[PDB]
Amino acid sequence: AALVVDNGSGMCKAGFAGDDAPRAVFPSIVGRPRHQGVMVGMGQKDSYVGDEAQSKRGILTLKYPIEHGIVTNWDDMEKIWHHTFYNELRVAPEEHPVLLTEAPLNPKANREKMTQIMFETFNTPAMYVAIQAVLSLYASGRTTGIVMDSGDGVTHTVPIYEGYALPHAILRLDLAGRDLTDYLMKILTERGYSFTTTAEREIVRDIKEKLCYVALDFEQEMATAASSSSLEKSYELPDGQVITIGNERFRCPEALFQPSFLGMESCGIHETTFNSIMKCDVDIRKDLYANTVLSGGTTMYPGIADRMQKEITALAPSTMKIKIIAPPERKYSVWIGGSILASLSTFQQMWISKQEYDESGPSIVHRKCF
Amino acid sequence: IANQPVVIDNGSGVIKAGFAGDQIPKYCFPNYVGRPKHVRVMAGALEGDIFIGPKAEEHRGLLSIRYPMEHGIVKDWNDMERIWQYVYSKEQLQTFSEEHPVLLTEAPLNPRKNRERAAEVFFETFNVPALFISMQAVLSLYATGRTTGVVLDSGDGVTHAVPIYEGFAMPHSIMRIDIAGRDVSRFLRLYLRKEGYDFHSSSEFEIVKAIKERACYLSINPQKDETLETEKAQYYLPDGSTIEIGPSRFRAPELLFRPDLIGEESEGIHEVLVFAIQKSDMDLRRTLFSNIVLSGGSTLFKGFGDRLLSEVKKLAPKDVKIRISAPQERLYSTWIGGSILASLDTFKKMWVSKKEYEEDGARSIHRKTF
Amino acid sequence: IANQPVVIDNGSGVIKAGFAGDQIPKYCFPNYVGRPKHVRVMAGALEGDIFIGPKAEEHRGLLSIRYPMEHGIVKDWNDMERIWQYVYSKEQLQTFSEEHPVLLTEAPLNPRKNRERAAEVFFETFNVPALFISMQAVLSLYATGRTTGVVLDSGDGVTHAVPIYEGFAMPHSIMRIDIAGRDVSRFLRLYLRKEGYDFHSSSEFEIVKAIKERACYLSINPQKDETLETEKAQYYLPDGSTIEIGPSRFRAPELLFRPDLIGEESEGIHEVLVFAIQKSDMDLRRTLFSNIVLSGGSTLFKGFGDRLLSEVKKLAPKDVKIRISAPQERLYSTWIGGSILASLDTFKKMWVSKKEYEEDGARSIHRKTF
Amino acid sequence: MADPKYADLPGIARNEPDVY
Ligand SMILES: Nc1ncnc2c1ncn2[C@@H]1O[C@H](COP(=O)(O)OP(=O)(O)OP(=O)(O)O)[C@@H](O)[C@H]1O
Ligand SMILES: Nc1ncnc2c1ncn2[C@@H]1O[C@H](COP(=O)(O)OP(=O)(O)O)[C@@H](O)[C@H]1O
Ligand SMILES: Nc1ncnc2c1ncn2[C@@H]1O[C@H](COP(=O)(O)OP(=O)(O)O)[C@@H](O)[C@H]1O
């Protein structure tokens, strides 16, 4: 009946309500070609979208519409929604209701503009905007627990206890997968593997997904890298060329735990989660320590849950029992939560309608959200 | 309609409940209504929006707690109606208000308007067959089995001393103060902020009570303890962060003896006990000195009775046998005597029936109590 | 050794210094320690690597600013020692610490450990002959010339109302809340991210303070301003890029009156002013209402004094003469009174001498301040 | 007996010694 559409900054995920996993999965990209006066043969698309842009990557200027969970170009975001509904899902938006997701502490105008596009342009019967962390917690099954959500757009934390979100203890963070990908691309240039153009941005992203892992101890990993060359793995590109890097596997995702490398002057993901828990009430800290949930693609590095356990225990008192909930399906946890929320019978009375939107306007969504 | 009557022992700190002819109250829980601070975004949360008893004790951090009674005087009448409804409801008693007669309790010399409005609640909103209101001192002596006795009690709200002699309560010898356990806990909180560790929220306030219950003692000589340097004992929170209490643990209960510390010139516990014996007649004084009974929670401090003896030795006439008695069950002494009073056959004569209340009104309730 | 004594008006936001008997403090600079983010490659650069005062204000963007003092409680003691050393150095005062006595200032109901550590710094690291710690309320009344009146103050750290009647400060009626200018500036930043124009860096944080100082106002009726739609007035940043502020300008300083917005159940300024008057004895209340003195920078919002009076009219008893007075120099109120107090001949009796500290220790400082 | 709060070793009472 209802459609769930997790508009992620990287991978735009979408499908149906009451499902195990999403059908439509693709990178939210809109590649426009090299505009030269020379002609093109047997016709082509003026602006590609999704997997088509990824396939024909070499030529196209890959521009993401969402930057840090914030929609910059709205015409680009409108084309991706259109690509999700008609091409991938093969179903009109007028029949099915549409669950959407944004990160917490976003601009207030973005929900209003997102909702305006759904009702005016797409003619949706009913829509809703949920917090990503709230859905990630709902996919995991627990009512209680903090959610250290981390995608390519935005890392953020939302502490919740017994089905009561703590909006003032929320802490949004500028560090994310895209900033890690840019950092890996820079340190690759330092060892003679220069990647400037946006076509190579996806190759270094794919290198980041495969090889990189979180260090248990950074100074120890740096010492072993200088001594031995067993850690130095090789990755072959789409092209037959193959490259080898030693230091850059553990050093790339260390930027999460040490933002000083990127030049952000912010708290690391390990202590940002701690600072979120300390901002909550003193009586409900034990359960937040016990249920330290992870979600998103930036939590898919091997050994990240072990590093979070080391750092949070180091920050917190010795008496506390720290525990990180790190499921196998944490990459697609936000969408799974939306599918379970859409499947419930209580959610049928929580939708916005066309008549309610015509009466109120875009400002009705802020009341419905939280 | 003479079913097994209910014994509701009221009080600002704790509210004891149960049936007549029992050894100990089965239903003891703290007297406050808890309502959630935060927003409930996620479904499957703690329903009701009003938390009383063990749910409120379990989920403190969510709830903005507020005490309905201050100094044995209910300020918020809607909150006490909800608590008395919760007492009767299926979560505690599992019985109707229509079946059983009610035994209510109040501190002496309280506002008569509050006693009238209490009766109005039990007769109109609840449909009670018969109500009876009684004193704390008379009930404490019922539990011990005595008739002669000065009852120095110290609850959360009120401290007072009613001198009874062979079943003759002297109303004009009653000495009362509005300085008690809550003010000592509030005074301890103020000291802890001066030490360093700040507590401000209402859920966060009950941690200070738990510190006061556990780690506090009364020094026999306070000037000697001042001149000496303390050891600074530790305490663990529900969070796990350690707190060095210091001299605030011994200086906190000095509010009971020196009420000039809070900045409110009253008599004090020891002076109230002496003044109650002095205001009574000449021949009754020596019997009243021999029978001094203790009750309430703020008599449970370490070295309380030892210091209360020494203060009586300082004030009272020389070469007189002082005996400050104090049963094992001091906290439930008032409830036990009510259960004993309810079980006796004379109880039927003392109460105010619903028919008598409908005919006369408040005047009949004022006549039957005294 | 009785030289012209130094006044050091301590504060979280701003620190003000000079000598006794002066009309206005000559040396007003912000209380923080800027340290450079970027690496210094080229020679002939800014030397020292620890920036305090006008150099730090001039070169914001280079320096990672961090405040040592939060809520009148120094966390980073090494930074405050460097600030006090910078005050005494040739860049500001051009004097030795050994010659002059010191008048330090602190907020009421602070941690006593900070007061001892403050004294240790002045007596041992600096070699001060005599030190004296005083309250902000008592000094503000010295500046005006009065003895009676409540002193409502609101700087960057603390908001506290001290009722003083004819040279008698009542310590048990001193109300305090940690909801001052810094929390308002932090709440304004969070609102500007909701508007769209996000700020994250520490040098970039002081732009929000400049926005808070310039373009903000406290409305009389907040519900009426919520129903009406704002005009979205502009403000130009130090760069040049314009910012449409919107409803974030007026709802930001509402935090001072409504502390539930940030997520911390406290009194608020208007409740603290009433509560301080109500905690005092009956006969002094009407004189305390007639004499209300404002102070600090967070009382300088547009329509603040008008809102304070409306809130006092709502809470306080009817038909009572309310009068909220203030000095012309509200920021320099506490320093001028200290300079007056220092120049008095009695000041010699009040202070803690170096010899007295070496003999007794912390006890003599706790005996002389209060 | 059953219930949360009790005091162990205070004694029932504190009494002054009886002289002749
Ligand atoms: N196996 C992996 N290891 C490390 N990083 C990964 C891995 N897979 C994906 N990523 C990173 O995470 C991103 C995947 O996005 P994700 O599935 O978290 O949803 P999203 O588009 O970030 O939306 P949201 O912000 O709602 O999570 C990629 O852009 C990539 O940089
Ligand atoms: N062991 C203890 N030591 C010190 N104080 C206690 C102890 N137990 C309870 N109290 C205090 O006494 C209060 C409970 O006393 P109680 O007689 O039940 O008051 P009331 O009957 O007026 O509700 C609590 O609020 C608590 O602060
Ligand atoms: N005109 C103004 N309007 C609003 N806020 C101001 C204004 N001027 C200063 N402030 C705020 O108040 C603070 C100054 O108050 P002050 O009492 O000097 O603080 P401190 O606690 O450091 O002594 C500044 O840090 C600033 O944030």
In brief:
The structure is cut from a larger assembly and holds 1 copy of chain A (370 residues), 2 copies of chain B (370 residues) and 1 copy of chain D (20 residues). Chain B has 16 helices and 15 strands.
Overview of the structural elements:
- This is part of a larger assembly, with one copy of chain A (370 residues), two copies of chain B (370 residues) and one copy of chain D (20 residues).
- With 370 residues, chain A is an alpha/beta fold.
- Chain A has 15 helices and 13 strands.
- Chain A folds into three domains: 169 residues, Nucleotidyltransferase, domain 5; 108 residues, ATPase, nucleotide binding domain (Nucleotidyltransferase, domain 5); 93 residues, ATPase, substrate binding domain, subdomain 4 (Actin, Chain A, domain 4, Alpha-Beta Complex).
- Chain A has a six-stranded mixed beta sheet with strand order 3-2-1-4-5-13, with helices on both faces. Chain A has a five-stranded mixed beta sheet with strand order 8-7-6-11-12, with helices on both faces.
- In chain A, a hairpin with a 4-residue loop joins strand 1 and strand 2.
- In chain A, helix 4 packs across helix 13, helix 5 crosses helix 6 and helix 10 crosses helix 12.
- Chain B contains 16 helices and 15 strands.
- Chain B has a five-stranded mixed beta sheet with strand order 12-11-10-13-14, sandwiched between helices.
- The relative contact order of chain B is 0.15.
- By secondary structure, chain D is mainly β.
- Chain D is 0% helix and 15% strand.
- Chain D is built from no helices and one strand.
- Chain D starts with 12 loop residues before the first strand and ends in a 5-residue tail after the last strand.
- Chains A and B meet through helix 4 of A and helix 6 of B.
- Strand 14 of chain B pairs antiparallel with strand 1 of chain D.
- The complex binds adenosine-5'-triphosphate and adenosine-5'-diphosphate (2 copies).
- One adenosine-5'-diphosphate (ADP) binds next to helix 5 and helix 6 of chain C.
- Chains B, C: Part of the ACTR1A/ACTB filament around which the dynactin complex is built. The dynactin multiprotein complex activates the molecular motor dynein for ultra-processive transport along microtubules.
- Chains B, C: Keywords: Acetylation, ATP-binding, Cytoplasm, Cytoskeleton, Nucleotide-binding.
